[PDB]
Every structure is written in C-alpha cells, then in structure tokens.
Structure 1
Amino acid sequence: DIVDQVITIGKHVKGYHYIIANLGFTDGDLLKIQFGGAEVSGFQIVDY
C-alpha cells in the first residue's frame, strides 16, 4: 500500500532510498518500482 502511494507521489525516482524491514521481501510486487530508479533493499529468508 505504502509503495503504491510512494509511486503515486512520485518519490520512487533517483536519489531516494528505501529499506523494507520484512522477511519475504520478494513476496510483494517490486516490478512497479524496479524501473523508477530509487534504490530499494530488503531481506529474503527463502533463496530460490
């Protein structure tokens, strides 16, 4: 939800940095912020 709102305000561009503080980081959809340029890092407990 928050991610959607960030993309809406347009704060997903370069120079912005986000840290997702939950496990199963890839569970949520990253495809929509992936092209924005803002760097996003998180944690994954299950290696595919």
Structure 2
Amino acid sequence: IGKHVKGYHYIIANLGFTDGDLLKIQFGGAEVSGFQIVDYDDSLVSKFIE
C-alpha cells in the first residue's frame, strides 16, 4: 500500500531488531527504529557467529 515512503516512522518493539529480514524497507524513505539485545558487534558474539 506504499505507507513506507518519507514521512512515516515505525518502531519495532522486540529485543531482536536484526533477527528478521529488514532490508525490505531499507530504502523506502521512512525511518525505522528498534532494539537489539544480541550485539553482533560484541567480540564474544563474533566468535560465536563464525
């Protein structure tokens, strides 16, 4: 329906932001904010992901 252009702004209310597919609205223009509890930038998770 096209409600993700510049003007809308969504909030993802779960501790898993990067756990789902999120590239789909990566260029729509709308702003998206969420939460991550599993910081994939932390050193222990990087050795875990490998």
- TM-score if structure 1 supplies the norm length? 0.78
Cα RMSD of the aligned pairs, angstroms, is 0.6
Pair member with larger Rg: 2
Report the alpha carbon displacement of residue 47 of structure 1 after superposing the two structures with TM. Answer: 0.8
Structure 2: where are the runs of 5+ without partners? 41-50
Give the share of equivalent positions with the same residue, in percent: 100
Q: C-alpha separation between the residues in 2 aligned to 1:29 and 1:12? A: 16
Structure 1: where are the runs of 5+ without partners? 1-8
- TM-score if structure 2 supplies the norm length? 0.75
